[PDB]
Amino acid sequence: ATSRYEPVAEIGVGAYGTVYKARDPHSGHFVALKSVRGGGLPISTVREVALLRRLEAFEHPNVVRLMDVCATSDREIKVTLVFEHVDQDLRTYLDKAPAETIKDLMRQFLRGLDFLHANCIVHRDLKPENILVTSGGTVKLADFGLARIYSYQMALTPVVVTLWYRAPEVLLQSTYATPVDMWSVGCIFAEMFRRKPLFCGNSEADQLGKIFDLIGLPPEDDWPRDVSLPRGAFPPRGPRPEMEESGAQLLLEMLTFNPHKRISAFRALQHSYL
Amino acid sequence: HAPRAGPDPRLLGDQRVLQSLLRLEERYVPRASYFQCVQREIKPHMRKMLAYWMLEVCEEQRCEEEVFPLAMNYLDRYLSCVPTRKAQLQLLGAVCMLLASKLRETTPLTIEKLCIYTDHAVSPRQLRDWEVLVLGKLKWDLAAVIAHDFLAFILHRLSLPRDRQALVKKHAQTFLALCATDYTFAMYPPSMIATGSIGAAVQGLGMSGDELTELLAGITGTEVDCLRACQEQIEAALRESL
Ligand SMILES: CCN1CCN(Cc2ccc(Nc3ncc(F)c(-c4cc(F)c5nc(C)n(C(C)C)c5c4)n3)nc2)CC1
């Protein structure tokens, strides 16, 4: 017998299409639906579905689970991805007042990203909206429409990540790898204490300036060489809101300018703080 | 403006990453020989003909090296579970290249470009329709592990300097494409095609052959005798690809 989930709430809209909370009116069970908006299928849809299908073989607890992919059809075909429903994102989870939870939240966040990186996957769009939390407190990473398998010598999409969570090497239009997600993790780690974005830049150059105001200006041996804007274009700045000693140490290793010295997700899970 | 992916030491040096690929690869190996029970009209020589056509399109368009073997992976997995007629082979192969390219390339193949190489009776509508059909039959599971994905991991475990690998890599790529054209390799684990191609390439360029075979087998947990037989088959297929 067939059943149907009917949409009961819009939970997001993007150029990628629309995400819906949906409910079977006969069973009461919920899912989430993401609906895709010579030619052919959009590249982002093919990539997102392919990566989730590869990851579905592991059933990792800290990644959203893709349940189904329906393609129906009129001239225009509609693709619908079906996800197990999660009640909220990280923003909704926080404005509900503990530090003990943040360490467990951070532990799960790092476990999910380490599982991606250990699977050759770079997310390239980590942000509070894409970090979901079930009612039971389980972190679920979402939105893999910008993600890719990282393969040595492949061409890369030059501009990735939303502005406020974008790594300096990407802001400087340099090459990048798995550390880009770790920079976003640092921004998200600090945002759990600030409850406000750490770097609210107005542009790419303004984002780098706000970044350098806290991390300090890298000398010269750390400045990337494959960039056009040199180090002398930015003013000199020095380093140094209510977290622990060892937590601040872990944060600085995530927010390291040079991505090769930036801490990995695995090493962060081994940090004294967690 | 146009960045290229460098060698991430966090990935190449983390043993769990290689272990993850080794665990995933069997998931993407085509089930069984579809030539005896599932396909009737479609014969092995037709697959080899289609493969060379696909390889020529990928070469003439300068696709990334993974696109052609990945398209052949989709082709074999599709033919393992969908009876297909000879007159539809070209359309199927064109769509497999389109999907592989869309997945792996920043500047992918387009439906209009594929119409250059397909016969003129094939239209963009059919390509759009078959893209959806192939996605459905493959359950959209396109991020397959293919032999090329192991290349950088294996070379990282050779102490041959990065620059001296340039010709090894180029030559190994010839063997990787050859294996994808040849149905006798269609069911080998991608890690064995990769180590066999590397072994054939490093030997063809000239620390001995037995020690290298021992090392290549140890890297992937493969039996030494099995790797030796695969490398000899790869070498023989090249010399006889006529
Ligand atoms: C209008 C604002 N209010 C208050 C804030 N609230 C946030 C919120 C966001 C999501 C969920 N639930 C949920 N459960 C399972 C999933 F799989 C996804 C999911 C899957 C995907 F593929 C996605 N791709 C993208 C781009 N998104 C974004 C929408 C995050 C995806 C989300 N989402 N619950 C609450 C929305 C309603």
Numbering used by the authors:
A (entry chain A): 2 to 38, 46 to 81, 84 to 107, 113 to 255, 262 to 295
B (entry chain B): 11 to 216, 220 to 255
Quote the passages of the study that discuss this structure, keeping the authors' original sentences.
Canonically, CDKs require cyclin binding and phosphorylation of the kinase activation segment (T-loop) for full catalytic activity. Aberrant CDK4/6 activity and dysregulation of this signaling axis is frequent in multiple cancer types and it has emerged as an actionable drug target. Of particular interest, phosphorylation of CDK4 at T172 (pT172) is critical for generating the active conformation, yet no such crystal structure has been reported to date. However, the protein structures of CDK4 reported to date exhibit a conformation incompatible with catalysis and binding of ATP or ATP-competitive inhibitors.
Here, we determine the first x-ray crystal structure of active CDK4 in complex with cyclin D3, in the presence of the CDK4/6 inhibitor abemaciclib. We determined the structure by molecular replacement with a model of active CDK623 and cyclin D313. The final refined model displayed the canonical features of an active CDK including an “in” αC-helix, ordered activation segment and unambiguous electron density at Threonine 172 that indicated phosphorylation (pT172), a state required for maximal CDK4 activity. In contrast with the kinase domain, minimal structural changes to cyclin D3 were evident, except for the N-terminus, which becomes largely ordered (residues 11–22), and extensively interacts with the CDK4 activation segment. C The cyclin D3 N-terminus (ordered after residue H11) buttresses the activation segment, playing a role in adoption of the active conformation. Residues R14 and E74 form an “electrostatic belt” around the activation segment.
